[PDB]
């Protein structure tokens with residue numbers, strides 16, 4: 275629900 | 289058809305078991321392995337930053353496992369990357385919260401942490417007694433409901449796949465995925481006579497937001513703390 279979580283998710287997704 | 293829905297239930301539960309981080313049987317086995325007063329004092333002596341850094345690393349690893357879970361759901365990899373990120377951003381921490389109930393023991397009111405079970409006092413160094421107490425109450429409520437492994441799997445799958453999340457571009461694909469998951473979960477709850485279990489789930493959005501906020505805070509201010 276913020277930018278750090280989105281960073282974690284983008285890293286783990288690709 | 290019924291067989292397809294049974295197969296979808298099987299596949300969702302299989303993916304969840306694959307990405308559940310810790311097998312429930314191991315958690316139940318370790319229930320008897322409890323932190324001694326010396327170990328609790330050790331955790332309480334840590335600095336607020338040390339303890340928050342450990343907890344945030346755990347939360348991050350859990351978010352990564354939830355991403356792995358999402359990637360194994362039929363159709364989630366077909367959604368565009370933007371929609372995948374919107375869904376994960378909006379629901380992953382709530383899924384972490386839900387999962388955490390498996391590691392909660394209501395009998396002694398302890399939780400699994402770094403190899404052993406300990407009560408709330410383990411987290412004295414976090415200085416967020418309100419949030420800690422609230423998350424323990426949430427886990428207590430979920431444990432009281434006897435939320436099963438298949439139920440956790442299906443409910444978290446639906447927490448992630450939500451077509452109402454602001455930011456989605458392909459709302460129809462997400463709608464279809466959510467509808468199929470709703471069918472699967474409804475069939476399972478009817479088979480098990482657990483239909484009313486969803487009216488008893490307590491809210492979780494605020495707690496998940498606060499956890500994500502602490503994780504982000506730690507990411508941000510890491511230059512003003514030790515490596």
Ligand SMILES: Cc1ccc(NC(=O)C[C@H](CCC(=O)O)c2noc([C@H]3C[C@@H](CC(C)(C)C)C3)c2C2CC2)c(Cl)c1
Pocket residue numbers: 309310343346347349350384387388389391392399400401402411420423424427
């Ligand atoms: C009530 C409560 C309920 C459950 C847990 N622990 C589990 O679910 C185990 C998991 C280790 C798995 C693994 O090691 O892979 C774990 N260990 O620490 C954490 C952090 C500490 C943080 C909770 C608070 C806000 C209290 C700091 C979660 C976690 C979960 C996965 C994130 C705890 Cl700790 C408290």
